[PDB]
Each structure stands twice: as C-alpha cells, then as structure tokens.
Design an enzyme around this catalytic site. Sequence first.
Site, short mmCIF file in Angstrom:
data_model
loop_
_atom_site.label_atom_id
_atom_site.label_comp_id
_atom_site.label_asym_id
_atom_site.label_seq_id
_atom_site.Cartn_x
_atom_site.Cartn_y
_atom_site.Cartn_z
N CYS A 32 -31.42 14.95 57.85
CA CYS A 32 -31.90 15.53 56.50
C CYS A 32 -30.62 16.03 55.80
CB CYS A 32 -32.78 16.85 56.38
SG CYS A 32 -32.95 16.88 54.28
N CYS A 35 -30.65 19.06 53.33
CA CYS A 35 -30.98 20.14 53.86
C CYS A 35 -29.56 21.16 53.91
CB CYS A 35 -31.79 20.09 55.70
SG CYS A 35 -33.39 19.29 54.98
#
Length: 108
Positions: A32, A35
């Site tokens: 991700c 993230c």
Amino acid sequence: SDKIIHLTDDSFDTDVLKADGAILVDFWAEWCGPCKLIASILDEIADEYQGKLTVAKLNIDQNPGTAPKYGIRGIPTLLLFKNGEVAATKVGALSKGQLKEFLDANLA
Ligand SMILES: [Cu+2]
C-alpha cells in the site's frame, strides 16, 4: 518507532479492547503506497500527542482477522478507539495537517 505499538490478531482484544483512553490504529500493508506516507509522520504524531493518545499499527497481511470485524473495505484506514469502542473513522491518504485536524476534532 519507540512509541508505536505493534499489534497482532492475538493481542488486539487485550491491548485495544481492554484499554481505557484514546488509541489510533493504523491498518496497513507493504503493498500500500499511501500507507507509507502516513507511516512517515506517525513518530512525530506520537510525540506531539503523548499523554492523550497512543498510536498503534496492524499489518493486515500478517494479521487478516481484525479488519473484517469492523467492516474495513480498503487501506489506508485509521480507526480511533475510545475505551474499546470505535469513536472516529478516516479512510484514504492524508497530509500531516489533515491528520492533526482529524485528531484535534475528536480528542479531549
Ligand atoms: Cu520511535
């Protein structure tokens, strides 16, 4: 990362659900992108809000059981728990300023 709590499916019920106070849980995974951005500003957040907030991270690839309990659809997703109950939710990428705004509006 000295103030960031590392959670697992095995310790979530204790470290989060049986704790009184405010805890910010960051659901993430290595694949991700957004993230990683959020992860680079957490150390600063943990220092600025210590005494009124605990910051924790939970990798959903290694610990796949917790996220579904709260109906999380995607990551990043940040959940703010207050005394074992979800009191605030925020999804998607966010800048340091937006995160600080989200916290100030939900803390005490
Ligand atoms: Cu640290």
